[PDB]
Amino acid sequence: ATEKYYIRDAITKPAVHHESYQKLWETKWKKPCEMGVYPFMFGSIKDFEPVAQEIIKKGLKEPYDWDEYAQMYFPKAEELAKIAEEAEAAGEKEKASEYYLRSSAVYRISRFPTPRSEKQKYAWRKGCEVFYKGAALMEYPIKEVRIPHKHGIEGEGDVVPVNFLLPPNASETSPVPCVLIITGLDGYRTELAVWQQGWRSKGVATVIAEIPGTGDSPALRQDPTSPDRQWSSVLDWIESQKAVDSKKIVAWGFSTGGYYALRMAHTHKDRLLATISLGGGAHHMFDREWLEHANKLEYPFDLSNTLAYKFGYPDLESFIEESSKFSLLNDGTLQKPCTKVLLVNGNDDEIFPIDDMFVSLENGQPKLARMVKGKKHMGEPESFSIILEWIHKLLGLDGKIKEQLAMIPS
The missing domain is CATH 1.20.1440 (de novo design (two linked rop proteins))
Structure with a gap:
């Protein structure tokens, strides 16, 4: 190991x-x-x-009593x-x-x-x-939209609750690009909301959705295909918003969200201009060896136990027994054609291995990559500049990424 x-x-x-x-x-x-x-x-x-x-x-201290802690x-x-x-x-x-x-x-x-x-x-x-x-x-108020989960199956919730922000001059006559932000294991739509005013200021709509088994995601936790149904419902809804240009939807996955951004570049290739995985995984994130070590590394609490819970397993061992089925390599996702993909992470990431960037680059079509040497999870702060620079080029925005990034700190 x-x-x-x-x-x-x-x-x-x-x-x-x-x-x-x-x-x-x-x-x-x-x-x-x-x-x-x-x-x-x-x-x-x-x-x-x-x-x-x-x-x-x-x-x-660990092990935390979460009721005692939360109170x-x-x-x-x-x-x-x-x-x-x-x-x-x-x-x-x-x-x-x-x-x-x-x-x-x-x-x-x-x-x-x-x-x-x-x-x-x-x-x-x-x-x-x-x-x-x-x-x-x-x-510029951010609103909740309870998107009908029309692609949901038995046991799934009836809605996909998202944040929505539309820039003021947006119309069917002059439609705007949309950044679909996919949130992580701990940060949900109430957290990644911090990015929405910046995009609004650059003439870009935002939709923020949680991954399966987090926030208010209606998706089956244990079903690897549950995200596929969720994004079908979300993209159907964005397509219905005529003030948004459905040919300019960019999915940006943060953290565990990165796995979902990489997956949907394949599953929803024809509906997405691009996807970005920032500090995401693909394959080795599901390894026994990785999961049996990651509870005690850079993540603030118990990463592997938290991940197991998010995937609908009662304990870590039960998750590890089945975790291979979530691999984008094992399930054949990475063999499929993808839309434009940008992969960014710190080499020294102890939440998801940089080895999964390599697995992502070892399968299917070439992907854009920036590795951040000597940095851990997410390769901050250079990763945010790399990603905004690329999206600004992709969407033909003003390229004023410093102005946008300065709006993030509270």
């Missing part, structure tokens, strides 16, 4: 943040929280630091929602928006990595509620 992957014996070095929440906060989370970036988009250090201090005093965030989440409600009543639109989104950030982290308890499931519903109240009070 120490000789199997690109990162070699890096897989055997346990990350310090697994020792305690205090180590998670001090070594991994405090910095991005202060900077207002993932996983703390729309958030404030002023909100999280008090909560962090109280969790650290309790000495919470630590609720007093702050509720405080911020009450401030937003008062601002809204006073006609303080910009203030109400800020505090609803700040509330949504606190609820979000309470149900990281994925809702696996009743209080985390509660926090998901409450987080969506205050997110959409905040989104509704944006200058």
Whole structure:
């Protein structure tokens, strides 16, 4: 196993943040929280630091009691929602928006990595509620669309809930490109929402949809073909929005979303101008060896257990027994023709192996690739510049990617 992957014996070095929440906060989370970036988009250090201090005093650590853990965030989440409600009543639109989104950030982290308890499931519903109240009070409001899941089968939900933002001058006469953002294992439509105003400012529509077994995805967790049905429903809906140019749909998968972006480049080739996989996997992400090591690496919590839950398995061993069936190599996806594909990741990724970029490049048609040497999951920040530069060229946008990226930090 120490000789199997690109990162070699890096897989055997346990990350310090697994020792305690205090180590998670001090070594991994405090910095991005202060900077207002993932996983703390729309958030404030002023909100999280008090909560962090109280969790650290309790000495919470792996294995976490997710009800006990989630409850630590609720007093702050509720405080911020009450401030937003008062601002809204006073006609303080910009203030109400800020505090609803700040509330949504606190609820979000309470149900990281994925809702696996009743209080985390509660926090998901409450987080969506205050997110959409905040989104509704944006200058250019982001809306929820409950897309009819017309391609759904027995056991699947009736709708695909998405975020939707349409630039103001968009019309059937002057239709706009659309970036379909596919979210990840922990960040859902309420998180990747942070990208929508930037695209709007460049004259680009956005639709944000969750992967199977996360957020409000209606898709069967254990069925490898469930995403295929979901994207058929989503693309049918985008096609019905005549203000969107259905010949200029670009799918950008973040994280685990990258797997789905790469898959749909094949399954929905004729309906997509391009797909981007940023820090995605394809094959080796499903290996026993990778999954048996990844729980203790760069991911903040238990990646492999969280992944198993998202795929509808009660434990890691049961997932590993069947995980090979999700491989884009094993299921024959990578042998099919694809639309334009861009693959970007850090070489040293300990969430999904760079080895899966190689598997992706070893099968079917040539794909665009940028490897980011000496960086781990997602190859940030250069990866965001590489991807925006390419999409701007593809869609003939203004190429002002710095202006767009500056809108991300909260």
